[PDB]
Amino acid sequence: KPTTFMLKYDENGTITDAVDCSQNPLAELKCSVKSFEIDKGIYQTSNFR
Amino acid sequence: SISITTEVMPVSMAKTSVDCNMYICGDSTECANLLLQYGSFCTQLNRALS
Amino acid sequence: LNAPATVCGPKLSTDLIKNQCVNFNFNGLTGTGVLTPSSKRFQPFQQFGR
Numbered sequence: 018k019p020t021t022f023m024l025k026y027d028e029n030g031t032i033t034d035a036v037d038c039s040q041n042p043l044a045e046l047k048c049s050v051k052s053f054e055i056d057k058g059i060y061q062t063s064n065f066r
Numbered sequence: 067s068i069s070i071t072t073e074v075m076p077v078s079m080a081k082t083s084v085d086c087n088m089y090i091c092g093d094s095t096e097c098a099n100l101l102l103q104y105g106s107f108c109t110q111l112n113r114a115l116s
Numbered sequence: 117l118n119a120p121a122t123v124c125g126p127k128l129s130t131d132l133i134k135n136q137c138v139n140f141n142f143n144g145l146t147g148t149g150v151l152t153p154s155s156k157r158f159q160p161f162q163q164f165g166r
């Protein structure tokens with residue numbers, strides 16, 4: 018299906034981690050911040066729903 | 067004499083936030099694809115407003 | 117995209133879908149949104165409003 022993903026490339030040219038922006042609100046937050054590590058607090062997200 | 071006088075001072079203003087993707091390309095997939103080419107510009111305004 | 121369209125194209129029509137984010141096509145005016153009934157009144161022979 019046509020979906021939105023975010024991928025991480027390491028120091029050897031391979032894919033090591035990925036996330037789907039339409040699955041969970043936490044994953045949507047990760048896709049909005051564009052990082053895998055997020056801190057304590059409240060954020061505002063985009064519409065990948 | 068005893069005089070009471072008043073002084074008015076502003077303290078805060080309204081807090082606002084803007085959704086960049088729905089302001090620029092409203093419900094358009096093609097415009098969304100063309101907007102990702104302009105990288106890390108919509109994430110620079112949300113930081114300022116926060 | 118000014119008046120009622122009198123000469124047109126060979127496309128098949130489709131039944132209406134209500135209250136769902138679907139891609140509409142009204143006389144070549146493509147878009148994406150949800151469809152609701154209306155209580156607005158139009159001028160005669162005027163197609164759409166902005």
Ligand SMILES: *[C@@H]1O[C@H](CO)[C@@H](O)[C@H](O)[C@H]1NC(C)=O
Pocket residue numbers: 028029
């Ligand atoms: C990947 O890159 C790192 C750092 O450049 C290097 O040390 C390593 O040998 C490379 N290959 C693998 C298989 O990790």
